[PDB]
Amino acid sequence: MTHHTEVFEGGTIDIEDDTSLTINGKEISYVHDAVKNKWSSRYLPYTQYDSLLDLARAIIRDTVEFSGVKEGS
Numbered sequence: 744m745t746h747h748t749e750v751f752e753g754g755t756i757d758i759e760d761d762t763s764l765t766i767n768g769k770e771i772s773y774v775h776d777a778v779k780n781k782w783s784s785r786y787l788p789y790t791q792y793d794s795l796l797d798l799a800r801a802i803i804r805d806t807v808e809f810s811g812v813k814e815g816s
Contacts, residue, residue, distance in 0.1 A: 755768075
């Protein structure tokens with residue numbers, strides 16, 4: 744238990760121990776816009792997102808890197 748699995752358009756979302764943002768096993772380091780730190784997520788720089796769950800899905804949707812089979816066109 745205590746883990747959330749989710750498949751977004753081919754990308755697996757790994758949430759472990761009710762923490763840890765991972766996609767396809769790759770560590771997703773969030774950067775919050777909070778008082779502690781004024782910066783954007785390292786994987787999505789200067790892009791505006793709404794929530795944390797939204798963020799995770801936005802990454803997979805915006806980057807084909809987490810989609811899998813696509814090196815280019």
